[PDB]
Amino acid sequence: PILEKFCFTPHTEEGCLSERAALQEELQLCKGLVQALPSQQELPRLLSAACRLQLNGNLQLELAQVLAQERPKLPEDPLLSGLLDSPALKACLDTAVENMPSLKMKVVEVLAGHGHLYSRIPGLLSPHPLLQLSYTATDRHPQALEAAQAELQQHDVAQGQWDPADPAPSALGSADLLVCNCAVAALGDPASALSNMVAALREGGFLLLHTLLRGHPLGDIVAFLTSTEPQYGQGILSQDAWESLFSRVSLRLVGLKKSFYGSTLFLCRRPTPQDSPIFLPVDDTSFRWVESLKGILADEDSSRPVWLKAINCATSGVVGLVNCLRREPGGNRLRCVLLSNLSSTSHVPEVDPGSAELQKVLQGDLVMNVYRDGAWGAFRHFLLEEDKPEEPTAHAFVSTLTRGDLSSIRWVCSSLRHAQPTCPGAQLCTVYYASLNFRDIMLATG
């Protein structure tokens, strides 16, 4: 079975990867070499080599090229792939999958050669049972990505030739989701690249962009390097600079996941033709609202969206309602809004049409719009840690978690935690030495 957990996931988050210890040590090391102008990780090795050849007046060329760095091991770096390893990537992909009119998804990657997202993305979408996916990986030059062709073949991915600088080929055409991974891959021009991408992007589609933000420690550290390749320098821009860039291409920001050190994951959507929305209270206890909703949905000729908003109680199951309806005919028009604060202290924002918050969410246009403790987000599914929980217990017995495999012998909590000492026939006894007989071996071996 596939095991998962159903949790609230705020749209905009900061300091995502604080918990990890390895990343913090990597950051401390990296800043150390930078200071005054040491690990198995690549980027620290690159910085050490850069500082090694000269303590001052380092050549851009020599640091640009060096043994053990010519490979695309930078994406293999923990820091550069950190947020991609987090649940942030799965959250963004789930948001992209949910907000699709149809059950099929056409996702095209730009500069797949260095981004390497092609390996990670298709696996993350295996849990979705009914989804059908069509991935294509594109690069500026065919000889790039000439390797790992077995890796592409084992999955269902398609090569590509689009150079983000120029307009996308009609073969790609309109696609639901575009993934770039600009962190390691270089974009020739921010404005032009984004313009071409949004052009290729269908209406109501998503543009998932992973980038390193200038104005942050790691951002400046990388900015010093890669001075030989001007393009990659253009791939580094300020957060406010990105915010300005998105507006220029009339692309609305829908999501943002920001790491403690600077790695970010922008999610922006291609605005759909504006249309008058319908608002139907779905809070009545008598369930009389069904008749009205059954009506509004009835007029299939119309194309206006429908917004089911419940604000009276935090126990409305409107999310499941919209999930089941979107599979029914006419359900594409449905979009939900739920205000479910788990703390009485937290205030309830006003969702009246006049209020700003409703305008902002309407601009978002996401199907699921849940508000909990002052943060707009949606429930998401996440695979749970494979490891079995352990607790400090004074009672435990040796058990074979897999019949016939002595490697599975482990200590498990016991029923003796609950016992009564009064009974003379009980005589609970502590154990200091226990013997193994032939029968125990026969049992364990199977």
- Both tokens of 52, joined, read 């090694």
Q: What's the half-sphere exposure (Cβ side, CA atoms, 13 Å) at 356?
A: 0
Calculate ∠ Cα 182-74-231, nearest 5°: 40
CA distance 438 to 175: 65
Compute the 3-state secondary structure of the chain and give helix, strand, coil in percent, each to the nearest 5: 30, 20, 45
Taking the CA atoms of 219, 224, 228 and 231 in sequence, report the sign of the dihedral they define: positive
Angle between the N-to-C axes of helices 239-248 and 190-200, in degrees from 0 to 180, rounded to the nearest 10: 50
User: What is the C-alpha to C-alpha distance for residues 267 and 258, in angstroms, rounded to an integer?
Assistant: 12
DSSP string of 76-139, one letter each residue? TSTTTTHHHHSHHHHHHHHHHHHT-SSSEEEEEESSHHHH-HHHHHHHHTTT-SS-EEEEEE--
Q: Check: CB of residue 106 under 8 Å from CB of residue 79.
A: no
Return the DSSP state at 273: P
Under 8 Å between Cβ of 270 and 203: yes
Angle at 99 between CA 93 and CA 104, to 5 degrees: 80
Other beta carbons within 10 angstroms of residue 379's beta carbon come to 16
b/e map 35-64, b = 16+ CB within 10 Å: eeeeeebbbbbbbebbbeeeeeebeeeebb
Give the whole-angstrom CA distance, residue 288 versus residue 330: 20
Distance CA 240, CA 248 (A): 12
- Helix (H) or strand (E) holding 217, with range, is helix 217-224
Token pair 């040590």 in the structure block, residue: 25
Please work out, in degrees rounded to the nearest 5, the angle formed at the alpha carbon of residue 67 by the alpha carbons of 65 and 72: 75
Q: How many angstroms separate the CA atoms of 116 and 81, rounded?
A: 10
Which parts of 121-249 are beta strand (E)?
132-137, 157-158, 175-179, 201-214, 237-238
Quote the CA–CA distance of 398 and 408 in Å, as a whole number: 10
400: β partners: 409
Taking each helix axis as running N to C, give the angle between helix 87-98 and helix 117-124, from 0 to 180 degrees, rounded to the nearest 10.
60
Three-state secondary-structure class, residue 141 = coil
Angle CA 85–104–275, to nearest 5: 100
Breaks in the chain (C to N > 2.5 A) come right after: 37
Q: How far is Cα 24 from Cα 21, in angstroms, rounded to an integer?
A: 5
Non-local (6+) Cβ contacts of 407 within 8 A are none
Q: Which residues sit opposite 159 in a β-bridge?
A: none
Specify which residues 291 forms β-bridges with.
none
Three-point CA angle 26, 32, 33, nearest 5°: 100
Q: Which residues share a beta bridge with 406?
A: none
Residue with tokens 């509004």: 296
What is the number of alpha carbons within 13 Å of residue 81 lying toward its C-beta?
Answer: 18
- Report strand pairing: 370-371 vs 334-339: parallel
Q: Which amino acid is at 239?
A: Q
Two structure tokens written together for 133: 């996916």
User: Using an 8 Å Cβ cutoff, are 261 and 217 in contact?
Assistant: yes
CA separation for the pair 15, 13 (Å, rounded): 7
| Phi-psi sector, 192: left (phi>0), alpha (psi -120 to 50), beta | alpha
Q: What's the rounded Cα separation, in Å, for the pair 52 and 138?
A: 37
Pairing of the two strands 12-13 and 157-158: unpaired
Give residue for tokens 């008749």.
Answer: 291
Report helix, strand or coil for 64: helix
Q: CA 378, CA 369: separation in Å to the nearest integer? A: 6
State which approach was used to obtain the coordinates.
cryo-EM
Tell me how far apart the alpha carbons of residues 344 and 316 are, in angstroms, rounded to a whole number. 16
